[PDB]
Amino acid sequence: PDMISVFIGTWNMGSVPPPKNVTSWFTSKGLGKTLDEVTVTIPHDIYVFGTQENSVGDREWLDLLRGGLKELTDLDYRPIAMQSLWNIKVAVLVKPEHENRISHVSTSSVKTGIANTLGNKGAVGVSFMFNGTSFGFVNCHLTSGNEKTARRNQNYLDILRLLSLGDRQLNAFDISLRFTHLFWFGDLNYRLDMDIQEILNYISRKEFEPLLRVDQLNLEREKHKVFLRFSEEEISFPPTYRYERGSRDTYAWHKQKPTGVRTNVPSWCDRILWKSYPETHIICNSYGCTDDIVTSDHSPVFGTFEVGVTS
């Protein structure tokens, strides 16, 4: 073809296995810029899944994917690559009609953290050539905590510099330049710079712009300190973190435990960003979160893209 559809899913699963049905994730049905207004489920050319706090072993986890897509699309999707760094996992699967259109499949992982305290923070990446065009997919999980924006940016640049995706002719290059299309997603862990009470009312009024204007990620992009020249689809879905398990009508922003009280204001922790080489084309058609996948204190986020490929 000339254009291809690429699904990207990122989901911090909360150290807890997924439920049997996660169709909503795969089909971009939920809140935000969604595909609720389609009934024929049209398969995508490439499926990319990023997860954080994944308790499922690497082998078992790719089976569920392969199966969920076979049951949704009737096609035996071929897995191209998988990378894990402890509980950070990414997998890429492809429509069988494109298996031999793919080459130079690379994988890498990097453990961010100058004295990374728990040490489950880092990234995993895969890169490959679809016909003549090269792709990169970075799934990461950066430093947690409301006040740790500085550590998150340092993690970003550490991933940026120390991750060896693609082949080694691209090495003086940096990741934002090694690839035709570079998708960066995961639990970036940036939070809202506002007090609990105002955040909740804005969410209850469905007024998201006053919240997005104090989102830490947006702020540090606007200070030109991270993700320089990356794009993000505008966000029109509620913060995906953090919910009580069981449902999606309760932000667990102040739960007391024998390990200390945790005050995490609702935030858009889970993001899909992208950067393309100039004069190359890419359009985002969905960007949202599900509202029925309840196993995790995060809700999964989806993004679909039409991407141009050569031949």
UniProtKB/Swiss-Prot annotation:
Keywords: Actin-binding, Cell adhesion, Cell membrane, Cell projection, Cytoplasm, Cytoskeleton, Diabetes mellitus, Disease variant, Hydrolase, Immunity, Lipid metabolism, Membrane, Nucleus, Phosphoprotein, SH2 domain, SH3-binding
One GO term of the biological process aspect: regulation of actin filament organization
Residues in the signal sequence: none
GO molecular function: actin binding; inositol-polyphosphate 5-phosphatase activity; phosphatidylinositol-3,4,5-trisphosphate 5-phosphatase activity; SH2 domain binding; SH3 domain binding
Any single GO CC term annotated in Swiss-Prot or TrEMBL for this entry: lamellipodium
Record localization: Cytoplasm, Cytosol; Cytoplasm, Cytoskeleton; Membrane; Cell projection, Filopodium
Mod. after translation: Tyrosine phosphorylated by the members of the SRC family after exposure to a diverse array of extracellular stimuli such as insulin, growth factors such as EGF or PDGF, chemokines, integrin ligands and hypertonic and oxidative stress. May be phosphorylated upon IgG receptor FCGR2B-binding.
Domain remarks in the Swiss-Prot or TrEMBL record: The SH2 domain interacts with tyrosine phosphorylated forms of proteins such as SHC1 or FCGR2A. It also mediates the interaction with p130Cas/BCAR1. The NPXY sequence motif found in many tyrosine-phosphorylated proteins is required for the specific binding of the PID domain.
Disease entry from the Swiss-Prot or TrEMBL record: Genetic variations in INPPL1 may be a cause of susceptibility to metabolic syndrome. Metabolic syndrome is characterized by diabetes, insulin resistance, hypertension, and hypertriglyceridemia is absent. Opsismodysplasia: A rare skeletal dysplasia involving delayed bone maturation. Clinical signs observed at birth include short limbs, small hands and feet, relative macrocephaly with a large anterior fontanel, and characteristic craniofacial abnormalities including a prominent brow, depressed nasal bridge, a small anteverted nose, and a relatively long philtrum. Death secondary to respiratory failure during the first few years of life has been reported, but there can be long-term survival.
Quaternary structure note: Interacts with tyrosine phosphorylated form of SHC1. Interacts with EGFR. Upon stimulation by the EGF signaling pathway, it forms a complex with SHC1 and EGFR. Interacts with cytoskeletal protein SORBS3/vinexin, promoting its localization to the periphery of cells. Forms a complex with filamin (FLNA or FLNB), actin, GPIb (GP1BA or GP1BB) that regulates cortical and submembraneous actin. Interacts with c-Met/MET, when c-Met/MET is phosphorylated on 'Tyr-1356'. Interacts with p130Cas/BCAR1. Interacts with CENTD3/ARAP3 via its SAM domain. Interacts with c-Cbl/CBL and CAP/SORBS1.
Name used for this protein in its record: Phosphatidylinositol 3,4,5-trisphosphate 5-phosphatase 2
Record organism: Homo sapiens (Human)
Gene of this entry: INPPL1
Entire protein: shown range: 421 to 731 of 1258
